[PDB]
Amino acid sequence: LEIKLEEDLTVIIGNNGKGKTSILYAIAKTLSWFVANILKEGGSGQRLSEMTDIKNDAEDRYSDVSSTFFFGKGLKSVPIRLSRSALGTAERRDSEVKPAKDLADIWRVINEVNTINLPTFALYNVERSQPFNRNIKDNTGRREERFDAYSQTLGGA
């Protein structure tokens, strides 16, 4: 499948079980690498599942999620591919996540020397809308700290 998302707004529609949540899940998995490498140097983002993400009746027994990002005319293409081979397969498939690491390294290093505005990556799945009680006192982490805005930002809730 191939998608040509718009710059400002993209709306995916269809029946139930057509793969819209799959597309959003793949995009969030791709963006987790940007978030992880913004937070840490060489940080590891989320990866495709080897139990449920590979097509059940695929012959190859691996799955790919390729993406291309645009960051202006000076950086027109940032290709990142997330791959996973099925469970119990001798040949494993690697992920090409180097360009995302490079872009996030640029962001983080430039931010360290002089504060710059950082991009916001957020996923709001169906996993939200759970009840909300004010049960969060010792929640460990410091909410004023600037880089707390990336904590659990692609979890869904």
Partner RNA sequence: UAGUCGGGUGAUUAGCCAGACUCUAACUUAUUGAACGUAUU
Stretch that binds DNA, among 5-13, 37-45, 69-77, 108-116 (CB under 7 A): 37-45
Measured from the CB atom, the residue of 77 and 139 that comes closer to RNA is 77
Name the binder of 4 from RNA, ligand ADP, DNA, none, CB < 5-8 A by kind: RNA
Measured from the CB atom, the residue of 79 and 119 that comes closer to RNA is 79
- Write out the two tokens for 73: 């005319």
Distance CA(101)–CA(35), nearest Å, equals 10
Q: How far is CA 94 from CA 20, 38, 84, 109, 113, in A?
A: 25, 21, 7, 27, 33
Q: Which of 10, 19, 68, 102 binds ligand ADP (CB under 6 A)?
A: 19
Distance CA(101)–CA(18), nearest Å, equals 32
Binding status of residue 30 toward DNA by CB under 7 A: no
34: left (phi over 0), alpha (psi -120 to 50) or beta: alpha
| Beta strands, E only, 1-157 | 62-69, 78-85
Measured from the CB atom, the residue of 49 and 68 that comes closer to RNA is 68
Measured from the CB atom, the residue of 15 and 139 that comes closer to DNA is 139
Are 53 and 63 spatial neighbours (Cβ–Cβ below 8 Å)? yes
Size of the site for ligand ADP (CB under 6 A): 12
Q: Which of 5, 58, 60, 79 binds RNA (CB under 7 A)?
A: 79
State which of positions 57-86 bind DNA (CB under 7 A): 83-85
57, amino acid identity? D
